[PDB]
């Protein structure tokens, strides 16, 4: 029932359950109890919004706890990612669709309908609700701030609709640039450490290969043409050359 949110990157991106995509642990742990337990068209849309607000508020609360109650930009990014996944679930463009997520889809199918124009109505319901869903995710911050609410998080970056694979590459990039110093320092600190690094970097290449392939299928079917343009936007002075070297074990450090 929306558990305590395992530590950052305690489980790496899983590319094996769904073979065409790599799923982050955060998405697997996304709080969906009220959405799952959803078993007048305008009224039932409202009831959905209420349950989504409750799931979003818990999600935001747990993400704040995961960040040790520090209201910083690291927290905003996690709120940005979880909000987007809520939207892709609501809109139907969620790439996980596993287990409980299949229940929330069928519940959404019964609310908006199965016909072709239903998917456009779920996109319109999300657009008139997404701002309220984002605010719910920071309600725990509002409850714990002794004074007024300061908006260190920015609505525009969170509320803007991107493809899920786009945002997941942004998240994977931040995950990669954090795991890299921890790994290059675990080597500079030896046949096991190299057999461990080169088994870590293989996960990173296999992940990036599956994401960039999912990128191509999504893009074809914002200043971004290649999947590396996403990393240039999201990351601090990101050089694509060094990145392909690192993931191909060519970098002039390894």
């Amino acid at each position, epitope marked *: 029932n929306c558990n305590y949110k395992r530590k950052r990157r305690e489980r790496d991106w899983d590319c094996n359950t769904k073979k065409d995509v790599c799923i982050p642990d955060r998405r697997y742990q996304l709080c969906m109890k*009220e959405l799952t337990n959803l078993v*007048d068209i*305008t*009224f039932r849309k*409202l*009831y959905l*919004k*209420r349950k989504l*607000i*409750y799931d979003a*508020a818990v999600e935001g609360d747990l993400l704040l706890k995961l960040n040790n109650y520090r209201y910083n930009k690291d927290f905003c990014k996690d709120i940005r990612w979880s909000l987007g996944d809520f939207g892709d679930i609501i809109m139907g463009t969620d790439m996980e669709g596993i287990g409980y997520s299949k229940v929330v889809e069928n519940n959404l199918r019964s609310i908006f309908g199965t016909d072709e124009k239903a998917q456009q109505r779920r996109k319109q319901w999300w657009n008139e609700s997404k701002a*309220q869903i984002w*605010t*719910a995710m920071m*309600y725990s911050v*509002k*409850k714990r701030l*002794k004074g007024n609410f300061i908006w260190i998080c920015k609505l525009n970056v969170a509320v803007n609709i991107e493809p899920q694979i786009y945002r997941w590459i942004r998240e994977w990039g931040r995950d990669y640039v954090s795991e890299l110093p921890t790994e290059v320092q675990k080597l500079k600190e030896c046949q096991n450490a190299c057999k461990s690094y080169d088994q870590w970097i293989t996960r990173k290449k296999n992940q990036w290969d599956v994401l960039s392939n999912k990128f191509i299928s999504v893009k074809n079917a914002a200043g971004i043409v290649t999947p590396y343009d996403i990393l240039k936007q999201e990351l601090d002075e990101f050089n694509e050359v060094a990145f392909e070297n690192e993931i191909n074990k060519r970098d002039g450090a390894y």
Partner: single-chain antibody
Amino acid sequence: VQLQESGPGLVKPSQTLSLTCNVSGDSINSGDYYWIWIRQPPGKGLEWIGNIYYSGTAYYNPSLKTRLIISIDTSTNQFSLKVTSVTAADTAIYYCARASTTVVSPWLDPWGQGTLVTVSYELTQPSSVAVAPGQTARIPCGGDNIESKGVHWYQQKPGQAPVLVVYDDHDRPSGIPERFSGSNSGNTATLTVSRVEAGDEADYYCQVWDTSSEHPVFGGGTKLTVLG
């Protein structure tokens, strides 16, 4: 934004009571709000009656469901309450109020003037806190893991409708003095009134939102008496 009830004031027992809330300053034809009816027997606390959504849907207090009809008319900016087959236990002041649909924990603001009519989550707060002038009154509100919820506080002076003084556990509306503050930790939320003036003498209700059936839950109330 202003609400106001209008009703008979006296009703023959076996008949049906009819009330009407006229809202001004804002349009009722919007999904942004719940439209709620609250009644209060003389001397007792606050009882939730029912809500209505601008789409026409309405749900009621389960203990009175069979005798309640809440209707809305978007084209005249009003919603109405009807209590059928009334008894002596229905004598009460009836308030209409408004609650947001867009926040995690809705509160009721504003409230109607209130009209007297004559013929499962539980919040626990004490009946009375009594302090001398200038002292510090602390009104506790008990609930199982109440910190997981956002609790609000209303002040009701005698003969008047309740007035929101604290919401989201520590927020004060514009008109409220800073002496009123709010806390919420563990299983107890606390309204703290510092420098207790004589004008602070009123009943104080903590309120929480029931997330399973979407209606407000009130504590029993706490009378704050100033001993002089």
